[PDB]
Design a protein around this ligand. Structure first.
Ligand SMILES: *[C@@H]1O[C@H](CO)[C@@H](O)[C@H](O)[C@H]1NC(C)=O
Ligand SMILES: *[C@@H]1O[C@H](CO)[C@@H](O)[C@H](O)[C@H]1NC(C)=O
Ligand SMILES: *[C@@H]1O[C@H](CO)[C@@H](O)[C@H](O)[C@H]1NC(C)=O
Lengths: 144, 49, 24
């Protein structure tokens, strides 16, 4: 609910909404237009009887009922399909704890064992570590 | 450059060269960026100064 | 303008396929 930023003394008629459209609205379609709705068979372009403006106001005052308050509505649309991920959740990090058996989930690789300091010569682009037989051996700390 | 499953990848490496132009000495080549382009790359063109 | 001369690439243009460190 937004009764503080969409309301004030002496009233406010800033917002608008449409009740008279030639047809229904396709999902995710914007219909920004000021076209007078036709009534009967007149080509009337104006305001008055049988000649209605397409959009009306959402006049807001700090004193209404609950069903008339200026609710702030935000809808989040997502695409959960087979496509490269670009926006996603806050992956959480923890401490390290060296020289101790521990389950590790470094940046998506999961395994078990003991981790400690090393003297690799890791190239800056390098992220993983392996051996002759393709087994994850050394992991660079993503936060250190 | 390549566009395997999208994910445009660019690998760059700068060598001061020798008196020749295209040398024969080996020069490893390191990645620089990889971003999810996901478009049908078919044609290629360069820009001049 | 430009030319279309052809030259031999020799041994050239090998990049790191992955980011996994190796040695020896
Ligand atoms: C990780 O982010 C924190 C938060 O600002 C910062 O203090 C720290 O230096 C960063 N470390 C690295 C390796 O980016
Ligand atoms: C063009 O790229 C899109 C990206 O996902 C892909 O789905 C599509 O198949 C590509 N076009 C062709 C002809 O393969
Ligand atoms: C490829 O290069 C070498 C010499 O530059 C030779 O095999 C042949 O002439 C070339 N092939 C062409 C130009 O189609």
């Amino acid at each position: 609910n937004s009764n503080k930023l969409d309301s004030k003394h002496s009233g406010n008629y800033d917002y608008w909404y449409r009740l008279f459209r030639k047809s229904k609205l396709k999902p995710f379609e914007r219909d920004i237009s000021t076209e007078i709705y036709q009534a009967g068979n007149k080509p009337c372009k104006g305001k008055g009887p049988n000649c209605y403006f397409p959009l009306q106001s959402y006049g807001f005052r700090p004193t209404y009922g609950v069903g008339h308050q200026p609710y702030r509505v935000v809808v989040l649309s997502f695409e959960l399909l087979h496509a490269p991920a670009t926006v996603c959740g806050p992956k959480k990090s923890t401490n390290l704890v060296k020289n101790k058996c521990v389950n590790f989930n470094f940046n998506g690789l999961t395994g078990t064992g003991v981790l400690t300091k090393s003297n690799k010569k890791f190239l800056p682009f390098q992220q993983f570590g392996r051996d002759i037989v393709d087994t994850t051996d050394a992991v660079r700390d993503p936060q250190t | 450059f390549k566009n395997i499953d999208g994910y445009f990848k660019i690998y760059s490496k700068h060598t001061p060269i020798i008196g020749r132009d295209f040398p024969q000495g080996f020069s490893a080549l390191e990645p620089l960026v990889d971003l999810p382009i996901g478009i049908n790359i078919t044609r290629f063109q360069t820009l001049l100064a | 303008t430009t030319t279309q001369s052809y030259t031999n690439s020799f041994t050239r243009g090998v990049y790191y396929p992955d980011k996994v460190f190796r040695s020896s």
